[PDB]
Amino acid sequence: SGWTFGAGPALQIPFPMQMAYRFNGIGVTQNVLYENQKLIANQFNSAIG
């Protein structure tokens, strides 16, 4: 759900779109995430590992 589960009813939303939301919230455009999605995913997986 993202952040809506803590401010009211839960709303379903794809996780890449939630990541685009969180990237646009800090000033970075959503295109860098919508294009380089595989790189961000691999970096996140490597960090989690």
Partner 1 sequence: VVIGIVNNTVYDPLQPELD
Residues that bind partner 1 (CB under 8 A): 16, 34-37
Interatomic CA distance for residues 11 and 14, integer angstroms: 10
Of 9 and 15, CB closest to partner 1:
15
Q: Closest separation between CB of residue 43 and partner 1, Å? A: 17
Q: Closest separation between CB of residue 36 and partner 1, Å? A: 8
Of 2 and 16, CB closest to partner 1:
16
End-to-end CA distance of the chain: 24
Cβ count within 10 A of residue 22: 14
